[PDB]
A paper describes a structure:
However, for Myb1, the nuclear translocation is regulated by TvCyP1. By and large, our study reports for the first time the structure of a catalytically active dimeric cyclophilin possessing only a single cyclophilin domain and provides structural details of its interaction with an intriguing biological substrate.
To elucidate the structure of TvCyP1, we crystallized it and obtained hexagonal crystals that gave optimal quality X-ray diffraction and belonged to the space group P6122 with the following unit cell dimensions: a = b = 38.51 Å, c = 365.70 Å, and α =  β = 90°, γ = 120°. The crystal structure of TvCyP1 displays the canonical cyclophilin fold with a β-barrel structure composed of eight anti-parallel β-strands capped by two α-helices at the top and bottom. With one of the crystallographic symmetry mates, TvCyP1 seems to form an anti-parallel side-to-side dimer, which was earlier confirmed in solution. An interesting structural feature of TvCyP1 is the presence of an extra small beta sheet between α1 and β4. The active site pocket is far from the dimer interface so that substrate binding to the active site of each protomer is not hindered. The dimer interface forms a pocket and is stabilized by hydrogen bonds, salt bridges and hydrophobic interactions between non-conserved residues residing in the loops between β1 and β2, α1 and β3 and α3 and β8. Hydrogen bond interactions between conserved G51 of the divergent loop and R161, R14 and conserved K57 and a salt bridge interaction between D16 and K57 are seen at the dimer interface. Hydrophobic interactions at the interface are formed by the residues M60, F78, M163 and M165.
Author numbering:
A (entry chain A), B (entry chain A): 1 to 172
The structure:
Amino acid sequence: MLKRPKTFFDISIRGDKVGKIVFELFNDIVPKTAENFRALCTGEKGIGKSGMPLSYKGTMFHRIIPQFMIQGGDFTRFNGTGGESIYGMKFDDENFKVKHDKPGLLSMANAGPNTNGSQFFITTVETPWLDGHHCVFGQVIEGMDIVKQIESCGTESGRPRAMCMVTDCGEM
Amino acid sequence: MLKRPKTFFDISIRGDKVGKIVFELFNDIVPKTAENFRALCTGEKGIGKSGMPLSYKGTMFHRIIPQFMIQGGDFTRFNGTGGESIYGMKFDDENFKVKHDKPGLLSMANAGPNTNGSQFFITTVETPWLDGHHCVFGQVIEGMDIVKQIESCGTESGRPRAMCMVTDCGEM
């Protein structure tokens, strides 16, 4: 019998520590996707195939769209073109059971079907149009205000107006 | 009678504060170029033409080449395609009096002649091949170890292996 894992990001904005976001991952619904996020928070898998630490520590939210989502998780290229899962470069969309039906959902970014690596995004609104297309695997249980601070650094193109960093992360 | 201005960057690497770099700017040799760096350290010019704060606070070293230089200063795009001077988008190469003849020199990055904005770079070796082509305008007087820590995050393509941030900056 397994519990939902908890992870956290420590956030800083524009160089200043702002607080902590705490996630709960649905390992009961998408075990393989949740477990990817869990390991990348802990860095426990060491050095990935790209020769980089498999860890969100020191990563940026490189795409931020107000009234939509914030996106991060690229720890090989820090610009949205990289990232790597614990399973390899890419892994398949596990399932689409959970809907983007509320704010503060954790969901896998992808460049098409079954291209999951390490990039994730956090919704700040309902985004049902992403249902069936991005795999929701956990939710924000603490720190939605921090999410809304990062969101407030965004533009409609997604280009950020400020650098928001995961300065530390791990499992609680 | 004017003294050389001093500025500083507070650095963090991979999310951890590492220390401070202190510069001395040759306002006696390149007054207009030094003054651009001075203002952008203080943020005193407020909001630039691109609608962003004219400030290095929260900016990244987006290009890092070991046994060469580290490059930062893009506060409009955070990837090497942006930046803005206090004089406008671009300003002319002031002069080329000072040579890239020692480590720890501050020099203006450019995409060709007279395209100076806000991107700078710090040499960690002698780079005489950049003489006559990039405008040297100050030097590192404290924290060369921090420069060498950032450099150690680089690759030969210039892609960084870690996120090194100016978390605070100003004039001393």
